[PDB]
Amino acid sequence: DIQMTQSPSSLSASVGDRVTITCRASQSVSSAVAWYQQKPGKAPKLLIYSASSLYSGVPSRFSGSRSGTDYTLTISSLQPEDFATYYCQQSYFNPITFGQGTKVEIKRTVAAPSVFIFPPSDEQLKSGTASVVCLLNNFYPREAKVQWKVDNALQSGNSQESVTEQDSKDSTYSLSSTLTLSKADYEKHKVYACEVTHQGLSSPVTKSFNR
Amino acid sequence: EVQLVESGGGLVQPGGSLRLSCAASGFNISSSSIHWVRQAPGKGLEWVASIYSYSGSTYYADSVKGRFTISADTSKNTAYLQMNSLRAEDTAVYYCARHYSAVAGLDYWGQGTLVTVFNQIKPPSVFPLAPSSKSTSGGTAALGCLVKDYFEPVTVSWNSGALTSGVHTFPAVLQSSGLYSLSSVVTVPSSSLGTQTYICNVNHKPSNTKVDKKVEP
Amino acid sequence: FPEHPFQEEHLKQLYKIVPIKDIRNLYVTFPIPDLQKYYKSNPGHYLGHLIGHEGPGSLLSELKSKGWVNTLVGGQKEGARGFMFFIINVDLTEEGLLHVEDIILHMFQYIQKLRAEGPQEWVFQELKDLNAVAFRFKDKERPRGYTSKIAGILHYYPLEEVLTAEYLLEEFRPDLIEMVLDKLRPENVRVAIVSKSFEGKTDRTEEWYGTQYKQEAIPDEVIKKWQNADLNGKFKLPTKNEFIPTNFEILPLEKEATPYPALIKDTAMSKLWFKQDDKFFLPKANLNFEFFSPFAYVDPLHSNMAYLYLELLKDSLNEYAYAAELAGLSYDLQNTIYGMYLSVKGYNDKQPILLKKIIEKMATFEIDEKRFEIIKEAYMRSLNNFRAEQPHQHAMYYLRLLMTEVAWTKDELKEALDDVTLPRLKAFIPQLLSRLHIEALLHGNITKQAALGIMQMVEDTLIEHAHTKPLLPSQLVRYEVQLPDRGWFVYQQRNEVHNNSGIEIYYQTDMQSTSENMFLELFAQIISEPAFNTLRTKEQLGYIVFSGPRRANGIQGLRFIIQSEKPPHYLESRVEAFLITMEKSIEDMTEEAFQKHIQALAIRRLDKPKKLSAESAKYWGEIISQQYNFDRDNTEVAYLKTLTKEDIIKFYKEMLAVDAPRRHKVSVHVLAREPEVIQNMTEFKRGLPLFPLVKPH
């Protein structure tokens, strides 16, 4: 029915930061809105009930507020366990909308990726599959621009870039750019160049090899 | 205090049907009721269902309105949900989560069951990387297995579960064939490529398949 | 009782109760004090008004715009002496059972609406006018029981306050409204849920009778959801009514010394038969208007067009017409196989202007799409149900069936519903309204020239909107099957559902000539009481056995409402046997039973006017065959005196003998749920003459 827009959808903020999270109501909503935590891989939580009231066991470092219609949760201070996907609720006999997601990330020095590249194994070539794994690893933050230059020609669509989450080691990320082709395109396109343009590495590092 | 022991959420087919059984112990479902929450993996939140066992008032979302039947044995305070016409996009963690006596207070939760409306179950074709001299950019290198063409994401450890630090196991890419694909890289020295050939301890969850695959130059 | 006995164990408390009757209801109860002293505005019966009100922007207007719960009630019920009840009962459907607390919350939003509205002075003046006119013009009562009723008032009220009991609003009381608002609180609620299917589920037990129920309370999340959601969206209060009747100073009867409806005006469009009130001198004026159209018999599609058009049409302005329904001033819209019909009833004050609004809105009418579709599907399921109806009901359907020039069948009606689109009739309405006819009938304490101006105004508005051009007089043509006058015909149509078999033998005599009128009436009633003697009472074949006349198309007839699963020819022979029974029995009836029985038919005929409505119904029968013979009473009575015992034998042997040349014999068989024969209904109307038509008036 009446929808809810959890602004911001994602953020990056270190331990001890005062964070304002505003679930944007579509219509005039009364005090019928909660606030949620979900740690990833875990069952969620309620942060704030009644749009301002703290629930037992949740610390005082979370201060919700009835804010007009676009109600606002104000985290007073972040913690190392507060890096979790957040939500809210809209409680009526209307179809209950929720948060649209807000995961807290950290601010950090812009860590460079371990810009590597990796061919598929020879067994995988015998399976008729090329997975050229251009590895980026241990980079903060996720914002980059990884480009494939197949036979020194910029190609897109054949790239598969799975990204690990905020690291347990140093709160960075890893990226396995997989140039998904066939062996009929592996031995065809011998030149496999992985142009990496991070936000910090705005200079395009183009990790290349020859078969 | 307020115990949300969910069960019953198991195996189903697209177009299928189930019946939930959540042991909502420790409290009264004659009191403030539990409800049901959609969350597909990688997707946001949607309210599923609502039993009012004190009053029999069932509630559903508009696409699923009518085609379910919810009930709760409130003498036992035990919740149920006869799930019906379960389509494949509904593969989602369904939370038996208690709403307490607040204006919006849903504070108690179950861990939720991933009622999976999947299509395939497939053991993996795990393949390593190819560490060549071109891959050894200096002493800094890495090694990994591509766990390829399998249906749940695998759980990969290294060297009988020894090498865990620096292991950046990627999220699985559920490709167009209903099959996942993830990598698991780990920063190793270029001298260790061949010296300590780490073997990925792949464990496919639905088919219960263990594929120990060696990575070697 | 100096205390409220609803002692805190029952507030905000469910009671899911199994009834004995197959019934589904829900009570909400409020112990309110003995405010019998507070009869100045009588806030409990004011809530019976306001909570009973279902008007524009209303709660029930929204929930029937939501379609869940059809009706409801909420008002002051007397409980014990010291306090009283406030019972809020609703209709229950099966679909509202999942929506219960939301409906409760709808109730609460209307409570919060009228709480945010607070007091209303215009309701006090309006309902004070209502009470003053209603108790002013309450007509009469049965004596017995009424005396004990006002004697029940006589305890609570002295010897000058037993008529003026609650029947006058003295002074408006916003703060007693606020007091009962403090009574009307969510905290103050008993809940009595009624459902039969909870047998073996309910445990807490009533003392005397032994029925079982449950406590099973509501948790505080839904309690507080009732509390905090005191907001106001779609719901709106009504406004003052546009009309109140004030002309009750009756107007005396002038120079027009006729005691009948007189044709005072006839144009190419209008034709005004007109009467003033001489009998009872009542300030109501009842109105009658037919909407003839050639477009009546066009299609089964056009049948449902006109039908469903009038249906939704009368339903649509009913949203406007709740103030009039609340005024008790009624009306009618009804279709005809010739067209439509309009009635307007109630007091003669503001009927023209309100009527002009009705005319203008039905002329200038907007069309909703989906609301109509719900109505379309509803009458679709209705016609689906129509195949499962009673053989006597379907026998009366035969009475409308084989007795015309042409009709449409229900199967023809069945396929054509697929053919229905909304722009079809939406474009057909100006096709419709460019040419049709309205004949005018006016009766009441009403003047002549003012009524001329009112009718001229209304038809002028009609021509203003859609320009309804007149007809030809041959364009008012009329629809009956010629007989061979001796041959007996019948067909069978087996039932689908009901196992009983239907049968009847018909006899048209003629038009309503004074001859044939007393022939049919006297002959029908003279066989009626020996039938009550032997066939019904003695034989006891089935319960639905009845004999009667037919009066339609200005044409007489003879019916035998008989429904029972018998072998066909067997029951034919029994009816034939009763024909032989009356053949001898009439010859056996001497002069004494003859005279007493014609006196019975006389007192049947002899009855004084009682209202305008009954005489007007007989007037409407005078209208529809265009005969207007307002003094055939004495004429047919004096003709009745002319009938002798031999004279009726003359009526027998020419027409009613087994070899009579005017043996108007025909039947229709209906079988169970499982001469010569009739080949086709096309053969039924293929080779025929037809009839002379009746001279009109």
Residue numbers in the entry:
A (entry chain F): 2 to 212
B (entry chain E): 4 to 154, 156 to 221
C (entry chain B): 288 to 766, 768 to 962, 989 to 1011
Task: Copy out sentences from the published article reporting this entry, exactly as the authors wrote them.
IDE can effectively degrade insulin, amylin, and glucagon, pancreatic hormones that control blood glucose levels, as well as amyloid β (Aβ), a peptide implicated in Alzheimer’s disease. IDE is a 110 kDa zinc metalloprotease that readily dimerizes in solution (Kd =~ 10 nM). Within the IDE dimer, each IDE subunit consists of ~55 kDa N- and C-terminal domains, IDE-N and IDE-C.
Thus, the cryoEM structures of FabH11-E-bound IDE is likely to represent the conformations of IDE dimer in solution. Apo FabH11-E-bound IDE showed a highly preferred orientation in vitreous ice. The initial 3D refinement of apo IDE-FabH11-E of 151,868 particles had a resolution of 4.4 Å. Further 3D classification revealed three major conformations and structural models were built. The dimer with one open and one partially open conformational subunit (open/partial open, 110,499 particles) reached an overall resolution of 4.2 Å. This results in three possible conformers where the O/pO dimer is dominant.
